[PDB]
Amino acid sequence: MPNFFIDRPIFAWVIAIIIMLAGGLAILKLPVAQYPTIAPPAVTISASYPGADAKTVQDTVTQVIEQNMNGIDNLMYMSSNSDSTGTVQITLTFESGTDADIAQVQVQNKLQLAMPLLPQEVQQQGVSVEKSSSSFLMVVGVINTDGTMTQEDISDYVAANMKDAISRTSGVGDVQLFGSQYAMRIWMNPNELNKFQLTPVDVITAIKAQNAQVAAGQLGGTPPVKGQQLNASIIAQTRLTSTEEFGKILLKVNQDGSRVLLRDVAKIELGGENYDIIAEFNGQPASGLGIKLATGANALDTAAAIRAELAKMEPFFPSGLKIVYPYDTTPFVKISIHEVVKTLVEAIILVFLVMYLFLQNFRATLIPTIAVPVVLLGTFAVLAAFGFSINTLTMFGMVLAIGLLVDDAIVVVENVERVMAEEGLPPKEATRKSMGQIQGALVGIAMVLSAVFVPMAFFGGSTGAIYRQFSITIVSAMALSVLVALILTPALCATMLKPIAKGDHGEGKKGFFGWFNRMFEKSTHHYTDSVGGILRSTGRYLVLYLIIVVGMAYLFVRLPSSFLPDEDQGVFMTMVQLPAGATQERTQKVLNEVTHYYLTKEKNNVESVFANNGFGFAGRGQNTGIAFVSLKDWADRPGEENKVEAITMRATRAFSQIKDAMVFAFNLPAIVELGTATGFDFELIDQAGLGHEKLTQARNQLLAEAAKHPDMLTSVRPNGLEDTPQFKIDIDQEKAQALGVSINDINTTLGAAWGGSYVNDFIDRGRVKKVYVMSEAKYRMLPDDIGDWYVRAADGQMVPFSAFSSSRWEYGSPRLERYNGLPSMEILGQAAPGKSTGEAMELMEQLASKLPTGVGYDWTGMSYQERLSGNQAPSLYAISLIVVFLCLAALYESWSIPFSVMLVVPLGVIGALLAATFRGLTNDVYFQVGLLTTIGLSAKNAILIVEFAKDLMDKEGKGLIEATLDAVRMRLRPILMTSLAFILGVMPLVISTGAGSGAQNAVGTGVMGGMVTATVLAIFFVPVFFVVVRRRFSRKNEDIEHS
Amino acid sequence: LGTATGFDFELIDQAGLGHEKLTQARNQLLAEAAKHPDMLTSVRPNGLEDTPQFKIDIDQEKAQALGVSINDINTTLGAAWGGSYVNDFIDRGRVKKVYVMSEAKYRMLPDDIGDWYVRAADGQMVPFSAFSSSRWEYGSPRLE
Amino acid sequence: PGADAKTVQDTVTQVIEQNMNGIDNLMYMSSNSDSTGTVQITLTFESGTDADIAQVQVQNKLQLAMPLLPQEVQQQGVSVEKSSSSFLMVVGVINT
Amino acid sequence: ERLSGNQAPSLYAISLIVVFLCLAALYESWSIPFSVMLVVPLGVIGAL
């Protein structure tokens, strides 16, 4: 193949240009996002039952839906929480790769047949089936800088006008509002209702009667009579539209004629659908939109089109409406592109330099500088062909691939320049000779590199998804390089290189380059002599190799492993936890103290703070809250003291003074759709009919045993909320029956007053919205207020609640956790300093196996992925090893020679294990992908060294030692060129601080160290390996040359 | 697919303007587009124009006075003049619908409205002309 | 049955319209609500979107709005169709 | 039409380029391809 394109350079160029043309044509069209789909696909059932407690939600909704989730494909586990705010969320998670749409749909239908078993209240509020593991693209905040709009007014504009036109903008696939559109609120007054012998019952009845829509038919309706000349819609009662119309609803005409109107017994206003969430943006009223990307969509273009559409709506906002962007992942991604493109640009610059250092002419300098961009660019087209996207893992996969891409180009050009210089051939026939030597090896090189990286893609779970990115990206670029190395680079070597005379090694040049040629000629003779003297006592250095291998093992065991590096992403969070039953106003004072700290004592670094009172990570309730901290650009946060990692500590430090709450700030994980990165997640389950009480005790029993092993378990805790006091009220069935007061009159009065009631719909400015009746606030606050509510009897007398009700206090959960249809408690935790989580798990397993009978347990989340993946890394790379051996066995046509190449693996491994433990980093996936890229380069140089030595023995008849010292001489210069340009290119990644540095540090520090030891050791070790392996496995007449 | 010719333009209410302000904006656009016959030909709405319709109002106070529940009122009006799907029957082994509706001659003109009666809680039969006032107005037969 | 266009729009059309969100490869949603008591809401997808997958997502989104329609509309049925498909023939049945 | 108008130029700017590269490979020349490619307008007019 090299010869065909040596005789057609323009054809080779047409292939290269076509390759490049498809790569850029791709790039323009590939999706671009931070991380590919890594979280397993998950579907979320969310329903609402206004006014409920957690138990009510669980047993009228949660359990009903839970008992119908069966017969569904590729399902892993089903958790649920039912909380005191009247909200259930049941989440079902599927195995990696299950068709997202197909999964949702099956769950959708299974819920459908349970829908008639839910209460009308839950059905009317709606039961959403979501695809939920998808991540937030941005969070739009909508404030009013004038101050003429509450968060409910802002919400309603956003809902009515902005929400639906942003669901329509390029690239979005789900939206969620921070509040509610308007709900017509009827704030009842109990003393007025009792004044006119009225109850909430009658108010609801009247709103249902006078705010309604009626089918009235038609004048001249079909079928008509003969000669009808008029056909017209008959318009009967329509929906109400204003607070005044609701005000004049005629409740009752007294005997004297006086009309009891709705406004006479209640206050009437537009309002929120519920008031459980307080959303503030820098302490100002705010609503907003949480936005998620569409599957397979570009993230940069979705933000650009959304912000452009928001800019298209701006002039049509009422005064003061500012759109602010407190959360947005777009900027961190543009950095990653700029940085990886930067890294790829400056990688090529360092090859132009090394090529002109050793070869000293700009003609040879141009060939690698052409072929590598060809290969990089084309790889993008290859990734379009498999469905992939321009992401962190793939981009870093390409920068990790640079080393292999360049060595194909250097080996070819150098070997031509060497063949031209050592033999005096014209550029054409010398390229022919050079390629004839390395072609077969370059092919076997490609086969072996694949056997290393391909097994990565067949890891399972979320980690397997990550490796798949690296595996496919790296393999694709490398094979494309070998193709280019057999097509274009031979053509370029034949036509561009100018003749070098035979014997000319630049030793006669003057100045910088003349000195260099002679120095390297000296050191090469030193190297070949040193190698010649090492082969005299091979027994000694096989002992050095052994010490080297056991040192690798001791390093690998004591290097702590991680998932992905935490990154300074520009935002972080803070959790607020007041005591049980703590109120809304109490949380708000705390969140304002939180926002005041960030805007004062972090004034340089914090741009904005988005506080949410009412919901948190641990659950919902008046006693939980969240604030999102939006920081200023990394450009204006210089040094470590202005990074997220540092800002998060100073917040938690200063909130240790806070006495009202428990406030805790923390940075995001690298992949937020996944979470954890640290430790285990343990669920404790009620398998018998034990109940919440016996379960919480078993939880604390486990937590006390786990706190009594601080050597192994640290920070074991429940994820859920603790029980809170609650007001139990009992209806005397006998006295109610006695007084003639029906139980329905009793309950609907209590609920619609204290919980509120969705009555019907009205039309607010052409948009249909809800109508809630609820007691005014001052009459539903304390147990004394219970007495001021009255129900009418069958005789017509008004009876107070204190007549047929007794009330006490008791404790209950504001957030019931269930796991797999059974009551559960989520227990979080991790391994102690310097311990394994797989072994901290087994202690937790043992600590749970001493809990009372009827209690079971299970691992969930990350801990479950580990239970069914731990035995992979050995087996996958036992396979990987075998294919490398068989490839070498085919390339060299020998069962024994392969060992001579394969022994170079530990030489590169230690350098990584050094630099990582030296720099204090972790065995994360960036490091491991780096390990595979470094092992591959050391093996390639070993292959080409062994190839040249064996070729010299076969087709030139030389002896073992001569061919060894001769091939290792020839391969010296290219091997140094490669390791030089590669170790320089990874330097900005190693010293990197600021944005994306954690990943760049991770990919970087491991590779650089691995390559140093790979190049410095293997130049001195692979000549040993070939000699001892050839002497152990042979027949006769080898050390002595032949014909 | 259709078309092959020309454009299709939708005019939208983005604020809470309403059908009325929208139709006016439509005719404003149509008049400007008819005043550029050099460029725009045959600009027109796809939808139907508004038609007269018979508005009938129920006096909540008088109905309350006479002891005539509003449900008795509305279900009578609708099932007579619009008809009502009541339940199913079996026609030759095949389940089919059962509609109740006024006979044609009693649901044709506004005078026919008066000939329909609703019973009060006391047991007296009350005509529709007792608790209803009616006028004429225009509305759309096809809201886009 | 028996409605005007407004009644159809605001008891049915708007209710269903406000639930058509979170659907893949959707381009635009038009509707007409007419004086004959009939609404038709049509949702059009990009070329190549899986016909079955598209219908099904719309089907489910309507399902959760169904309890907010009137019993009259529910009893008459709410059809979800693939509609851009063309007429093959039209059979006429007369009695000579 | 609003999201397709800029296609006919770009798609056939691409189409032109591949015709040139193919001819460049067939004839092993960067210049000879022009000799074939100039025949396009000769057929176009007859259609127009």
Numbering used by the authors:
A (entry chain A): 1 to 1043
B (entry chain A): 674 to 817
C (entry chain A): 50 to 145
D (entry chain A): 866 to 913
The authors write:
Resistance nodulation and cell division (RND) efflux pumps are secondary active antiporters that are ubiquitous across all domains of life. As part of tripartite multidrug efflux systems in Gram-negative bacteria, they span the entire cell envelope and export a broad variety of structurally and chemically unrelated toxic substrates. During drug efflux, AcrB undergoes a functional rotation where each of the three protomers sequentially cycles through the conformational states loose (L), tight (T) and open (O). Substrates can enter the PD through several channels and bind to the access pocket (AP) in the L state and the deep binding pocket (DBP) in the T state.
For the V612N variant we obtained two crystal structures in different space groups, which represent not only the TTT conformation, but also the LTO conformation as seen in wildtype AcrB. Presumably, here, the closing of the DBP in the L state is also unfavourable due to the introduction of the hydrophilic asparagine within the aromatic cluster. This is likely less drastic than the effect of the V612F/W substitutions, but could still shift the equilibrium between the L and T states, hence, crystal structures were obtained in both LTO and TTT conformations. V612N also showed a similar reduced resistance for many of the tested drugs.
